[PDB]
Design a protein around this nucleic acid. Structure first.
Length: 112
RNA sequence: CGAGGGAGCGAGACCCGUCGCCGCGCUCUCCCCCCUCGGGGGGGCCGGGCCACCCCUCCCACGGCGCGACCGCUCGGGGCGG
């Protein structure tokens, strides 16, 4: 698992080229010339009398609602809050004295 | 300031992915170096010739200078008729 072979000048633009990546990644010399009804799917279990029963994993629902909503289109761009990139103001640096305005400690001075 | 649309209503096997695009990151090749919360970063693997970086010669385009040939206007000398 190598790192990125080319740096980034700006967000979304490669540094050298596509061909310089062909040379840098060494795509040359990296050529890889590479030219039911009988069996149950996934049951597990047995039984004592009569043989071994076949269980069903994730059985069909016992109840169906009268109507349901259709699926969405995934929005193509959404990430969870944990995956978000954290921002920070330049003036906020460790050791800086801060003024808290909204909390019950209103107008108080605090070390960051 | 706004988000306004919703390409799964199957039985033994998903109640989901994603199309085109710039690409990139890695691996089915090999390594090395740096910083250590294994990750990140960096150097890469190799020959080639076009655009073209430093010296040369061709064809064309443009402008200027000089030379030669042809068409034109006009200033004279000579002869003819007037």
């Amino acid at each position: 698992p190598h790192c990125s072979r080319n740096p980034v000048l700006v967000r979304g633009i490669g540094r050298y080229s596509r061909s310089a990546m062909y040379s840098r990644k060494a795509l040359y010399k990296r050529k890889y010339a590479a030219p039911v009804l009988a069996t149950v799917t996934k049951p597990v279990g047995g039984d004592k009398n009569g043989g071994t029963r076949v269980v069903k994993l994730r059985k069909m629902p016992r109840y169906y609602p009268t109507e349901d909503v259709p699926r969405k289109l995934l929005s193509h761009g959404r990430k969870p809050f944990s995956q978000h990139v954290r921002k920070l103001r330049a003036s906020i640096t460790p050791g800086t004295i801060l003024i808290i305005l909204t909390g019950r400690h209103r107008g108080k001075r605090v070390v960051f």
